[PDB]
Symmetry: C3
Subunit: 248 residues, 3 copies
């Protein structure tokens, strides 16, 4: 005898490796492929809650003020005091917690999409603590289209995902949050027109969700992001992901 | 320069105020606007759980027997005994709780929609304790269309919302509950036909939800309803809401 | 005369009984009828979690690794240790629980549909512990169509439901799970084309859900399955259900 490895056009092992990676990249971008969304809530103790949803055609996550708060499973969370925090955040002077600022409040949110999203379809409702998009329902558009703010996460010249990050450093940064994006579809075949619409309804049923609180960004990077070939952007602006298209 | 306030057609401050209010009322009723649903569960201790959802195009809430039960966050809820209540309510003589009637059972339900709902589209599945609409699945239509029972909440001659209220005073009033309504659309443009269908799918992702148990109706009126310009109807048939159209 | 019972074509009581049963069977199969899905998670202590959803047009259930785990309401569940189990199952050697195998892990899953499902529409995402269908998102089709594996549950010659059962006997059988099916529609009228599409969106709102952990299969058979005329298949391959069509 056979040709020698890495010297000719008959390194079929090499060609197959490149195709395997290209096939995965392009399958993900096909209408048969996943589109995925991660919402990361960063807490002052360094821990990070991730909410993930993976689905065909479109994907979303919807959270309220309470559901974004840090919960340390199987440890003390002062649940009564934190309900009083909630009452005090839903209306000023509306509660009697033993604290001014709950350390269970997120300090920042990172939204990441898989590279298979179309950024023009991204929608976000970053609402107030009682789940209104813009102060009062009567004046609220139920979302903002924020795609232009999404940064490409590049690795080795390939877009491995998209990130929108915003800090919540101020005491009044008390939010509810929903996010939605639609899978790429450069064809003119509408996946939700009658020929395929019921499948999109089924995709709502079939969407897989994951949630966990990791003790720190290092642990998240190591045992979640890297383990499962997900894209990420850390606090030092370091990009993580696996470039696949046309690559060995 | 200038004319004197409140004496001529050049009180532009006055005209702008009236337009600001009219714009909010009419924006809410546009296809860009919210439709909102509140389900209030009233408990014997005077507290009130609210479940709220705010979304474009259509909105709904789905609860089971268990999820409607009173939960006092961070206080004693006798969770084992209340699981035995559940077993005893799912099937007669099916549990061994230390009580005949759980005070965590709702005594009444009020369903309120924003004025932007079309009442003809309202659907409710008030089912039994195991989440069947009408005793057995084989004979169950999955909803009832109850719009004709909805009372207008009028303030200053304007409809600020719609209410359907039913008490659960009897021991056998053990329910599951889902409710759905569609945003007004007097146009013939179908928001869920192919030109806009994927946006309606995204609205399912983007819908914002809120839940809280207020200690009493007074507190709910003060720190939830009134604070956020929501419609309400209290036990004394008093109407709450903010009239906007054509008004200063 | 009157004729004597059970001797002539004028036993109208008999004819009405047969029609009542036939009407229920056939109503369930009409587009006005329910389609229902049950996911049973079997634990080593003999208890069984059921997740049920009942809805018009289509129905689904989506669970993650954590949500399928046994929770004994109001009893000790060692929540910190079980969070460490989760960390250790999401990534090998990723936690520090006091055990090798959590007895809260399901030992098997049974998926049952009502007889009103079309088995060709059934879709399942049996994913890994972090909610990816097939190891990595890039290579994952978001479901498998498993209808050919569904066994008919026959009683008295009638199909009363469909079952797909799989054991999780191995230590590596750590899963996430979503399942979806569409209600029979032998007509060519698309329930999700524009004439009726918004109603299918409302059905997503209106779907009723039920969850409970029964202490054993006997109790489930007695107080859930049999009580509510649901189909079932027990560990000894015994079929349960109520035959209705053309029957008294
Ligand atoms: N492209 C390129 N890579 C370099 C160069 N010098 C060092 N490198 C390293 O080599 C890596 C790329 O190697 P290859 O993947 O085999 O080069 P390629 O350009 O992708 O060529 P093909 O994969 O054969 O199409 C990069 O990640 C660099 O870190 C250089 O001059 N050009
Ligand atoms: N319309 C009306 N309001 C009265 C009358 N007497 C007292 N009021 C009070 O005045 C309020 C309405 O005042 P306005 O809003 O300025 O009157 P309006 O009829 O709405 O007239 P415009 O807003 O200028 O179109 C009501 O809420 C009443 O409580 C009356 O005779 N007619
Ligand atoms: N069909 C049938 N059933 C039998 C026979 N012998 C005993 N059985 C029992 O009788 C039951 C059926 O009785 P029926 O429902 O009145 O008989 P059928 O065949 O359904 O007749 P129709 O309901 O009048 O149309 C079955 O469940 C059997 O357990 C037999 O020879 N033929
Ligand atoms: N020294 C080099 N000279 C020329 N081309 C390079 C070199 N290093 C990498 N490349 C190529 O340039 C392209 C971009 O790779 P690069 O490593 O810059 O991506 P990146 O990970 O986004 O970089 P960075 O994260 O440092 O901004 C790839 O096709 C890669 O093969
Ligand atoms: N004394 C009055 N004489 C004439 N018109 C009035 C008077 N008070 C209010 N109105 C007008 O009548 C219309 C209805 O207002 P009204 O206060 O009756 O509404 P409402 O809040 O539903 O009343 P209620 O709650 O007492 O049934 C409004 O346009 C208002 O400006
Ligand atoms: N002894 C019998 N002789 C003839 N027909 C019978 C007899 N028993 C039942 N049947 C009929 O045969 C058909 C199938 O009934 P059968 O009891 O076999 O269904 P099944 O409950 O699926 O049976 P199994 O569970 O034992 O496999 C029905 O129409 C029934 O009336």
């Amino acid at each position: 005898m056979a040709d020698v490895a890495g010297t000719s056009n008959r390194d079929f092992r090499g060609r197959e490796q490149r195709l395997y990676n290209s096939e995965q990249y392009n399958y993900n971008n096909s209408l048969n492929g996943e589109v995925s969304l991660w919402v990361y809530a960063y807490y002052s103790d360094g821990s990070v809650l991730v909410r993930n949803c993976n689905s065909q055609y479109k994907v979303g996550i919807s959270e309220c003020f309470k559901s974004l708060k840090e919960v340390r499973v199987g440890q003390n969370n002062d649940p009564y005091d934190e309900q009083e925090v909630n009452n005090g955040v839903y209306y000023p002077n509306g509660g009697e917690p033993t604290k001014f600022h709950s350390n269970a409040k997120p300090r920042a949110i990172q939204i990441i999409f898989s590279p298979s999203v179309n950024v023009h379809t991204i929608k976000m409702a970053k609402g107030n603590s009682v789940s209104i998009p813009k102060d009062y329902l009567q004046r609220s558009h139920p979302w903002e289209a924020t795609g232009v703010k999404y940064r490409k996460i590049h690795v080795d010249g390939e877009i491995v995902g998209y990130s929108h990050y915003f800090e919540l450093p101020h005491e009044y940064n008390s939010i509810s949050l929903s996010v939605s994006g639609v899978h790429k579809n450069p064809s003119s075949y509408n996946v939700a027109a009658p020929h395929n619409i019921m499948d999109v309804f089924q995709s709502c049923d079939l969407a897989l969700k994951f949630s966990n609180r990791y003790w720190c960004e290092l642990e998240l990077i190591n045992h979640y992001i890297s383990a499962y070939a997900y894209p990420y952007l850390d606090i030092n602006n370091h990009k993580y992901g696996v470039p696949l298209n046309g690559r060995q």
